[PDB]
Design an enzyme around this catalytic site. Structure first.
Site, PDB file in Angstrom:
ATOM      1  CG  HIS A   1      -2.308   0.663   1.014  1.00  0.00           C
ATOM      2  ND1 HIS A   1      -3.357   1.012   2.132  1.00  0.00           N
ATOM      3  CD2 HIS A   1      -2.601   1.545   0.510  1.00  0.00           C
ATOM      4  CE1 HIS A   1      -4.119   2.088   1.547  1.00  0.00           C
ATOM      5  NE2 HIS A   1      -3.823   2.025   0.493  1.00  0.00           N
ATOM      6  NE  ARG A   2       6.638   2.215  -2.083  1.00  0.00           N
ATOM      7  CZ  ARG A   2       6.198   2.223  -3.426  1.00  0.00           C
ATOM      8  NH1 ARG A   2       5.619   1.828  -4.104  1.00  0.00           N
ATOM      9  NH2 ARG A   2       7.041   2.944  -3.788  1.00  0.00           N
ATOM     10  CG  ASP A   3      -0.231   6.641   2.693  1.00  0.00           C
ATOM     11  OD1 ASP A   3      -0.806   7.153   4.162  1.00  0.00           O
ATOM     12  OD2 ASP A   3      -0.412   8.051   1.950  1.00  0.00           O
ATOM     13  CG  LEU A   4      -2.433   2.249   6.196  1.00  0.00           C
ATOM     14  CD1 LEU A   4      -3.363   1.554   6.916  1.00  0.00           C
ATOM     15  CD2 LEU A   4      -1.658   1.978   6.270  1.00  0.00           C
ATOM     16  CE  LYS A   5      -3.359  11.901   7.769  1.00  0.00           C
ATOM     17  NZ  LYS A   5      -5.311  11.243   7.948  1.00  0.00           N
TER      18      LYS A   5
END
Lengths: 267, 75, 186, 117
Positions: free
Chosen positions: C54-58
């Site tokens: 995902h490299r991010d799930l902000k």
């Protein structure tokens, strides 16, 4: 292209809504009517040519009828300065404009979104803020008599020939889709509770009526006449933005109440 | 190690005598058709032992399904 | 005179998540929060099940659709709180599932909590220099009173010595489901 | 198209009616205000209208006894169009240009306030 675009525009306007791979490529085959072309469609890509330097983002409006929006109360301020706007007056136009939010580094912002401001000369700032700092009490005391319908009333720059107008909020629905949803047949009735958009009233401190209000404001603390005039003007303003009242008898009685004074003796 | 028999736990229900059936068992059977937190509202069982042979069972949900305005999803 | 037949709609927009964290609460009972947690855990487990990063799930990447349903976004609580694995710029491939697991843990913990850690002292350069040597530890006083025992044990057990022996998703899901279906009232 | 008198009103100066073969107010509004309207041809076909007056509200009687005097007067036209549009609004239809409407009410209230100049 004229005969093609008049026939199958529905297909492209629908396709731009539901697709992700090819959206930027499709963002130029649209033709609109702008306020520099009386009876000729204008491309938005070609529109990117002629704007001013300090300006940011394109300005647009959505309405119900060509003539109905052709002369609107909001426009009468942003039209005197020689800018350029477009009209998307069709139910699907809202669907298109809702999703697309950019074109070649620019933004799409409409006129009725939480009080837009435009860069301009410095000397107008001080007089406008003087009106802010001098008219706080009338703005303070008017909210008491109006119960929880409107959120805030302020002075902004869209009004030169009309006293009042109504604008929506960013997080919420807009006026025309407020009717696309009611007119929609197969829908639930539990959704209205949440995402109705809260409403904003806008006043113009140029029409002498608002100043005439001040003398009775500091003169009379409260009475019947101020209530009558304010509810009348507010209900009229509700029609001004395309909103449809729920009790037309209430306003019809108020319009019939004075035509009898027009010929004189009521009794 | 693990032994997992729960692959088949729901007994077939449309074969038993209609008279000897209570409502709760309909309840648990309806629970394991759509994972939810609610029971049904009405049921219907019958059959037609004519030249055609078959049987049917129908239910009536309490709350309307939220996704019925689609066009061509897998019904 | 030439009648017609009814026509259907298309779909509607959902609202965001992070807006709910600061400004508007509209608080119901925490059962809805646990339901949110179980749907979002199931969704991210399904996504990662296909070897997908995902490299991010902000927390802004969540759309709260109809009812309480999570749609995962990508475009622009732990937006600056990832592991120093990001600061690791060796072999140009520090990316791993461990960062995603830790980020999900901290994000869900804060979302239950409802307010931001580390809002008083903010010095990015000094924070990163202190990360180089003299790294800090999370504060323990900032904890909810009604922290569930299973989730508290899981989060405490997640990070002891190294952020590499973390468990694998479906037993976390099983812990979620047992804690949910073990305390309705009885 | 047509103007007549019927038995449907007790306290309204005028009301509006549809044809025997024509969509009513709400039907026309809901049909045209929905997406994929395909208004190219079907839109410009429907919604015929008529009008009625009650001969009881003294406003119509004073209007008639005024009009019997002058046959080319000035206030007659704006008065009658004002009544027509107000009945139009309070009948489910939608006006074509609200700005002109609001302008007429604004000038009316201004002159009632006696501002002038």
């Amino acid at each position: 292209y004229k005969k093609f675009y008049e026939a199958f525009s529905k297909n492209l306007k629908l396709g731009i809504h539901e697709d992700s791979t090819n959206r930027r490529r499709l963002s130029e085959l649209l033709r609109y009517h702008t306020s520099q072309s009386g009876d000729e469609m204008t491309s938005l890509s070609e529109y990117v040519s002629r704007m001013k330097e300090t300006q940011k983002s394109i300005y647009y409006i959505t309405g119900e009828s060509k003539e109905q929006v052709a002369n609107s109360a909001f426009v009468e301020r942003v039209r005197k300065r020689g800018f350029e706007v477009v009209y998307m007056t069709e139910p699907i136009d809202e669907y298109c404009v809702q999703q697309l939010k950019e074109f070649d580094g620019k933004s799409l912002v409409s006129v009725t979104k939480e009080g837009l401001e435009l860069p301009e000369d410095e000397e107008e700032k001080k007089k406008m803020e003087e009106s802010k700092a001098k008219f706080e009490n009338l703005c303070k005391l008017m909210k008491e008599i109006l119960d929880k319908k409107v959120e805030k009333v302020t002075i902004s720059n869209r009004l030169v020939s009309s006293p009042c107008c109504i604008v929506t909020s960013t997080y919420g629905w807009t006026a025309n889709m407020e009717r696309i949803m009611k007119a929609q047949a197969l829908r639930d009735n539990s959704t209205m509770g949440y995402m109705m958009a809260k409403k904003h009233l806008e006043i113009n401190p140029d029409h002498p009526i608002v100043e005439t209000l001040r003398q009775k404001a500091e003169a009379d603390k409260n009475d019947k006449a101020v209530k009558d005039l304010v509810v009348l003007l507010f209900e009229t303003a509700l029609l001004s933005s395309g909103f449809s009242l729920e009790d037309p008898q209430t306003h019809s009685n108020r319009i019939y109440r004075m035509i009898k004074l027009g010929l004189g003796i009521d009794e | 190690y693990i032994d997992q028999e729960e692959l088949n736990k729901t007994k077939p229900i449309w074969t038993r005598n209609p008279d000897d059936i209570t409502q709760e068992e309909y309840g648990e059977f309806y629970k394991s058709l759509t994972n939810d937190w609610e029971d049904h509202l009405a049921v219907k069982h019958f059959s037609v032992e004519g030249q055609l042979e078959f049987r049917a069972l129908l239910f009536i949900p309490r709350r309307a399904p939220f996704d019925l305005f689609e066009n061509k999803k897998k019904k | 005179t030439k009648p017609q037949l009814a026509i259907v709609t298309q779909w509607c927009e959902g609202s965001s998540l992070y807006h709910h964290l600061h400004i508007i609460e509209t608080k119901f009972e925490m059962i809805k929060l646990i339901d949110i947690a179980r749907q979002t855990a199931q969704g991210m487990d399904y996504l990662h099940a296909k070897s997908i990063i995902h490299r991010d799930l902000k927390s802004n990447n969540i759309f709260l659709h109809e009812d309480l349903t999570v749609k995962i976004g990508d475009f622009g609580g732990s937006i600056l709180w990832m592991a120093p694995e990001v600061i690791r710029m060796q072999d140009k491939n520090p990316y791993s599932f461990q960062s995603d697991v830790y980020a999900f843990g901290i994000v869900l913990y804060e979302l239950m909590t409802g307010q931001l850690p580390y809002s008083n002292i903010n010095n990015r350069d000094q924070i990163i220099f202190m990360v180089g040597r003299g790294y800090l530890s999370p504060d323990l006083s900032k904890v909810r009173s009604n922290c569930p025992k299973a989730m508290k044990r899981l989060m405490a057990e997640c990070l002891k010595k190294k952020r590499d022996e973390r468990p694998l998703f479906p037993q976390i899901l099983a812990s979620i489901e047992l804690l949910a279906r073990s305390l309705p009232k009885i």
